[PDB]
Design a protein around this nucleic acid. Structure first.
Length: 119
RNA sequence: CGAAGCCCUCACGGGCAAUGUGGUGUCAGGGCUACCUCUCAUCAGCCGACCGUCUCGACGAAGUCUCUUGGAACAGAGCGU
């Protein structure tokens, strides 16, 4: 798909950007965990942004995140490193999956970043 | 529902696990909502016995009487337990 630059990947993992503000929103309020829960939020538009790891396995769990993000109209970003977005949510283990329903606090950098993607 | 979970270790500590441990649930059910009733089931844990098929072992009654045959009576006939 689109290629992220390792600059955007900083700022918000949930947003097009890479994780940073994404740690915010857990401390502030709202997030998701894995693919399963994250998928639900898109379904019932709750998440502003959700992220996806680039690596992925052949998991193809994250296979229908796009198209089923772009219907709902939920912007979602690519991060590199499943671990990277795994760590921002408080998770010892990495997760290919996504997030931020509410985007507390960073209703700011988040959404600014979304603009960067799909500029 | 979403880490509330599991394994190893006395512990310390380590490992697994959101690519989902665990809870719920599985064609009579459950959940959620609004009520009625009640818990007596289930599940976790505590304490914690009585009595008593297979094999082995102990103790254990009453003739070693007569005659005949015989190498030998455990035989025949007689008497008795």
């Amino acid at each position: 798909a689109a290629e992220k630059k390792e600059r955007l990947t900083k700022e918000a993992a949930a947003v097009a950007e890479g994780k940073s503000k994404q740690d915010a929103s857990p401390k502030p309020y709202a997030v998701k965990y894995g693919l399963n829960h994250v998928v639900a939020l898109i379904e019932n538009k709750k998440a502003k942004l959700v992220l996806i790891a680039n690596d992925v396995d052949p998991i193809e769990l994250v296979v229908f995140l796009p198209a089923l993000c772009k219907k709902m109209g939920v912007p979602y970003a690519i991060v590199k490193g499943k671990a990277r977005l795994g760590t921002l949510v408080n998770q010892k283990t990495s997760a290919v999956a996504a997030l931020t329903e509410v985007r507390a606090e960073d209703e700011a950098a988040l959404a600014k970043l979304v603009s960067t993607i799909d500029a």
